[PDB]
Design a protein around this ligand. Structure first.
Ligand SMILES: NC(=O)c1ccc[n+]([C@@H]2O[C@H](COP(=O)([O-])OP(=O)(O)OC[C@H]3O[C@@H](n4cnc5c(N)ncnc54)[C@H](OP(=O)(O)O)[C@@H]3O)[C@@H](O)[C@H]2O)c1
Ligand SMILES: NC(=O)c1ccc[n+]([C@@H]2O[C@H](COP(=O)([O-])OP(=O)(O)OC[C@H]3O[C@@H](n4cnc5c(N)ncnc54)[C@H](OP(=O)(O)O)[C@@H]3O)[C@@H](O)[C@H]2O)c1
Ligand SMILES: NC(=O)c1ccc[n+]([C@@H]2O[C@H](COP(=O)([O-])OP(=O)(O)OC[C@H]3O[C@@H](n4cnc5c(N)ncnc54)[C@H](OP(=O)(O)O)[C@@H]3O)[C@@H](O)[C@H]2O)c1
Ligand SMILES: NC(=O)c1ccc[n+]([C@@H]2O[C@H](COP(=O)([O-])OP(=O)(O)OC[C@H]3O[C@@H](n4cnc5c(N)ncnc54)[C@H](OP(=O)(O)O)[C@@H]3O)[C@@H](O)[C@H]2O)c1
Lengths: 283, 283, 289, 289
C-alpha cells in the first residue's frame, strides 16, 4: 500500500524543515506520491491525511507525534516518527539516518507497535458535555483557579476514594513517561495492558499512584460542593470545563495507534538515553 | 472438602491466642477436625499442613499470612485470613466478627482470589546457588555492607540498565503495598498481571520504578567488579548470599495462592482504612 | 494589656459567621473595645462597633483574632505584619499550623490569652517583586509561598533561577514554589518538599513536577535573595501567586525577585500549643512507643 | 605559607597510587616538606619521607592534600577538623562535591593553591554519641551523615525522635539519615531528602523508606540536639554508621545523641570552584536559556 505518503511537521525549526526537504526528495526519487500538511506546506514553496495516505511520516519530537496520533489512530493508517536528533519514546529515526531508515521501512523492514489511547467523556447526568481522545493522558486540574479541587474516584463502579488535590493524571503506557512520570508515577512498558492513575499535588501525603487493568473503566466525580469549575485536558491539547457534580469517564479506545519503528528499535535503549540510565558495566 | 481445618498463628500476643481459642471452639462445635500448628500448639494446653487440611485459617497480620502463603500455595489449599482488629491487604476478617465470617465461609459464601508468587533463582554460571519463592517481593540488597552495590538488569533477555544503588525491590501486586510502596512504588491492583521493579536508594536521581508484564522474566547480574557479597531476600524471610558476577532470575510461579475472603470483601475499602484515603464526600 | 481587639474572618462559611458572633459577645462582656474589619461588619449589620479596613486594623488594635483557619490566617498576616500587632487564630473545626483554638473552646482559650497566659513567636514572610526590565510590575508579600505557575495554560513553563545573583539552573516544569518555614507544610509539602521547623532561618525552593527528574528541592539561608527569570521564549504569560491569594501576570522575560521581609508576623498561641503535636495529628505521625 | 604538606589517600585504586606519585614529585620539586600518612607510605616503600598517623597529621601539617574522591574526603575531614588544618581534594576522575581537582590538572591546580590563589570555606560536622542509660557506648564524628539502620537484618526498626528534648514522633522504617549540608547531596538525597546549600546552618532528618507514607524529611536549625531512642522492643541490634565508614552496634533501648561539632573543617578549593556548577554537572541540571 505504501504509495501515498503523508508528512507532518512542527513548524518553527530550521532543522525540522531541513529534515522535511530531505525526506520529500528521498520519496519523490522513489516515485511515491507525497502529501504535505496544509500548514507545513506554507513554509516551503515548491485531519484528512489519514484517509488518503497509506503511511504518514511525522517529523518532530514526541509532542509532534502526540498531536498526530489521535487523528491517525481512528483512520487505521500507520505512523512513522523521525526525531530532531535524539531518540524519543515515539520518534526513533534520527534525522541524519533518514534515508537509510525510511528506505528500510518502505522496502518492508519494520516493526509494528500498537499503542492504545484513552477516551475521556464529560457528563452532566447522562448529557455529554465533551469527549476527547488521548494517547498520553487525561488530566483533571483546576484550570485558572489557584485553589485545590475535590473529587471522587470510581473504578469499574467501585468507590476508591475522595481526595483534595490539584487534580489527577490518568495515563496510558505511552503517557507514563510524560506528565505522570514528572508527577512521581512509574514507567509502564509500552506493551503493558495497564492504566496508571497519578494524583497531582495531593493534600493527603499517603496518596500514591495506582496501576489498574487496561480494560478498566474510570469515573471521576467532581465534588458538588466546589465553587470553581475545573478543567479536563487530553494530551494537553483538547480542553473541557467541568461544573461541580459533573462526571469524567475514562476507558481504553478500541482502535489503537499503528506505530512503526525501524527493525533495530530498542525500547530500553530509549529509556537509557532519554533518562540517563547507566549503560553496560565496564572494567 | 471443608472437614480438616488447619490453624496458624503468630505467637506473642494475648489477643491472637484469644482469637485462636474462639476459633477452635467454633469449629469443634461444627464437628470439624482441627489441626494446630506444631509451634502454636505449645502455647495453649488442651509445612505439612497444606497436605492434610482442606482449608487453613491464618490468625495474625499480613505478615503472618506472608509466611504461610509460600507453603500453602504449592499444596493447592485455600487460605483464609483473620486480622488483629483492622483490615489487612491479606487478612479481611475482624476478630470480633469471627463466628459470623468464618461460619459464612464454611457454609459456602466466600470469594476466591488467586494471587501469584515469584520464583527467585540465584546462579553462578548454570549452577544453582539458591532458590526461593516470594508472595511479596524479591529484594537485592547489600546485606551487612554499608556501601552501595552495583548491578545490571535484563528483562526477557534485553538489557535495561546498570545502576549503583542499595539494591532492587521486585514486587508482585500483593507486594506492591509493602516494601515497594515505602520505597516510592505504585500500588498495583491485586488482579493486575504485572510486576513492579523498584530501585532502593538509587545513586541516579532519574531512576524510577518500572512496571512490566506479569509473564516477564527478570535477570539481575551482580557486578563482577564489586568487592562485597550482596544478599537476596524473599519476603524478608529466606536469604541467599551472592558473589560478584552471580545472576538472580525472577519470574512468576505457575501455582498461585488460593486466597479466600468473605463475600463482602472490598479491596478499595482496605486501601482507604489502611492508607487513610478519603471516604465518600459529605455536605 | 489587650484593650482594643480586631476581628478578621474569611467570609463564606456559615459556621464562621456564628463563631464571630460568639467571639463578639465574649469580648464585649469583658468590657473590651471590639473593632470589626470593613467587610465583616457589612456581613452582620446592627453590630454598632467601630469598623476599619484590613490594611489599617494593625494601626489601632492591640490584638487581632482571626476566624476561619490557616488560609484565612495568611491574609491577616499580610496586613498585620507591618504593624507588629499580635494575631490569634481560631480553627474552622480541625487544628492547623497557624490556629490552635477550636470554636468549641473559644471562651476558655481566648480568655486565657487575654488573661496574660500565652505563647508568642514570630514568623517571617516573603516579599515578591515582579520587574519588566527596570520597571516594577507588581509587589506582594506572602506568609506561606510565592508560586510561579502557568495560570490557565496547560504547558510547562521555562525559567532560570538565581540566588544572590549566582546562576543555579534553568528548567522546564509546571512552575516553582518558594516557601517560608510556615509555608513548608503547605503547597511545597504536596510537591515533595521537606518540612522546615518554624525556628529555622531558611527558604525552600521546590520545582513543581519538573521535566528533569534529577531536579530536587534546595534549602537556602533565609537571608538569600532569589531571582527567577521567565524565559523570553515563552508563548504564554505565567502567573506569580502569593499565598494562593494575590496574583500577578508575568510576561516572557520578566523577573521575580524574592527575599525575606524585615517585619515579622507576631503569632500568639495558647500555652498548650505544641508544634510537634500539630505535626503528629495533622500529618498522622506515630506517638510514644 | 604552605611549608609542610600531608598526603592522605584511600588505598585500592591503581590510578590513585599513580596520582600520589605525581603529587609527591610535584611538591618535592617545589622544595616543600612532604609528610605521608602511615598506611600510604607502607603501600609505596622507598619514599624516604617523614610519616605520621592520620590522627596526628593535623598537628604537624600546614596543608593536607587528599587523593581519592568524596568518600576519601570524609575520613580526612574527621581527622583534620579538630586541627584547623586546611584540606584540598583531588578527584578520582570525575568532579565531586568535595574535590574540584582532576588528576589531569594536578600540577596546575595545586600550584595555584600553593601560590596563594584559592577559595576557603568551612563545613560543620556531626558528633554522634551512643549511650546505654548513662554509660557511653561509642562516639564518632561525621562530615556527611549519621545513619541508624538494621545492619544485616532485613526487618524494619522502630525508633523515637527527639529534638532539643521535645518528642517529635516514633516510627517504623528502614532507619534514619541525619545529614549536614555537606551530606545532604549523598545518602539523604537518594532517600528523597532536599539539597541544603553549604552555607545553611541546618541539619536534615530523613526517614529511610518509612512505613508511614506521611513521614517526610524535616530540616531543623543547625544548633539543635537530636535524640534517637532505639525501641526497647527490638529483637535485633541496629547499627549506627558515621559517614558509612565507622560503625557502632546499638542495643534495644540505646539512645543516639547527635549535634554539631564546634570545630569545623577548613576546605580549600581552586579559585575556579563553583558549587552550582558542581550541582549542574553532577546532577544534570539545565544551564543558560
Ligand atoms: N510537568 C510535566 O512534565 C508536564 C506538564 C504539562 C504537560 N506535560 C505533557 O505535555 C503533553 C502535551 O504535549 P504539548 O502539547 O504541550 O507539546 P510539547 O511541548 O511538544 O510536549 C511537551 C514535552 O513532553 C514530551 N513528551 C510528550 N509526550 C511524551 C511521552 N509519551 N513520553 C515522554 N515525553 C513526552 C515532549 O517531547 P519533545 O520535546 O520531543 O516534543 C515535550 O518535551 C501532555 O500529554 C503532558 O503529558 C508534561
Ligand atoms: N495542591 C496543593 O497542596 C495546594 C494548591 C494550591 C494552594 N495550596 C496552598 O494553599 C495556600 C492558600 O491557602 P487557601 O486556603 O487560600 O487555598 P486552598 O487551596 O483552598 O487550601 C489550602 C489548604 O492548605 C492549608 N494550609 C494553608 N496554609 C498552610 C500551611 N502553612 N501549612 C499547612 N497547611 C496549610 C489550608 O488549611 P485551612 O483549611 O485551615 O484554610 C487549606 O486546607 C497557598 O499558600 C498554598 O500553599 C496548596
Ligand atoms: N521499609 C519497609 O516498608 C520494609 C522494610 C523491610 C521489609 N518490609 C516488608 O516486610 C516483608 C516481610 O515481613 P516480616 O517477615 O518482616 O514480618 P512482619 O513484621 O509481620 O511484616 C512487616 C510489616 O509489613 C506489613 N506487610 C506485609 N506484607 C504486606 C503487604 N503485602 N502489603 C502491605 N503490608 C504488608 C506487615 O503487616 P502486619 O503488621 O499486619 O503483620 C508488617 O506491618 C517483606 O516482604 C517486605 O516487603 C518492608
Ligand atoms: N544508597 C546511597 O545513596 C548510599 C548508601 C550508602 C552510603 N552512601 C553514602 O556513602 C557515604 C560514604 O562514602 P563512601 O565512598 O565510603 O561509600 P560508597 O557507598 O561506596 O559511595 C558513596 C558515593 O557517594 C558519593 N559521595 C560521598 N559523599 C558525597 C556527598 N557529600 N555528596 C554527594 N556524593 C557523595 C561518593 O563519591 P566518590 O566516588 O567521589 O567517593 C560515592 O560515589 C556515606 O556518608 C553515605 O552518605 C550512599
Amino acid at each position: 500500500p505504501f504509495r501515498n505518503i503523508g508528512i507532518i511537521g512542527r513548524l518553527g525549526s530550521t532543522q525540522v524543515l531541513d529534515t522535511i526537504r530531505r525526506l520529500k526528495k528521498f520519496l519523490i526519487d522513489r516515485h511515491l506520491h507525497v502529501i504535505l500538511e496544509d500548514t507545513i506546506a506554507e513554509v516551503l514553496p515548491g485531519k484528512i491525511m489519514g484517509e488518503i495516505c497509506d503511511l504518514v511520516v511525522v517529523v518532530g519530537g514526541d509532542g509532534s507525534m502526540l498531536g498526530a496520533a489521535r487523528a491517525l489512530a481512528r483512520h487505521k493508517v500507520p505512523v512513522l516518527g523521525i526525531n530532531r536528533g535524539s531518540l524519543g519514546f515515539l520518534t526513533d529515526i534520527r534525522p541524519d539516518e533518514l534515508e537509510a531508515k525510511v528506505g528500510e521501512v518502505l522496502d518492508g523492514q519494520y516493526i509494528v507497535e500498537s499503542r492504545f489511547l484513552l477516551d475521556a467523556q464529560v457528563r452532566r447526568g447522562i448529557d455529554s458535555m465533551g469527549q476527547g481522545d488521548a494517547l498520553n493522558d487525561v488530566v483533571l486540574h483546576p484550570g485558572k483557579s489557584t485553589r485545590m479541587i475535590e473529587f471522587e474516584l470510581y473504578i469499574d463502579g467501585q468507590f476508591v476514594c475522595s481526595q483534595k488535590a490539584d487534580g489527577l493524571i490518568v495515563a496510558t503506557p505511552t503517557g507514563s513517561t510524560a506528565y505522570a512520570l514528572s508527577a512521581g508515577g512509574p514507567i509502564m512498558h509500552p506493551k503493558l495492558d495497564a492504566i496508571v492513575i497519578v494524583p497531582m499535588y495531593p493534600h493527603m501525603l499517603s496518596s500514591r499512584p495506582i496501576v489498574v487493568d487496561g480494560n478498566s473503566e474510570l469515573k471521576i466525580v467532581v465534588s458538588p460542593n466546589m465553587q470553581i469549575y475545573p478543567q479536563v485536558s487530553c494530551d494537553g491539547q483538547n480542553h473541557f470545563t467541568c461544573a461541580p457534580g459533573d462526571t469524567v469517564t475514562i476507558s481504553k479506545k478500541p482502535q489503537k495507534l499503528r506505530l512503526i519503528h525501524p527493525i533495530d528499535h530498542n525500547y530500553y535503549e530509549i529509556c537509557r538515553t532519554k533518562l540517563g540510565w547507566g549503560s553496560r558495566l565496564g572494567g
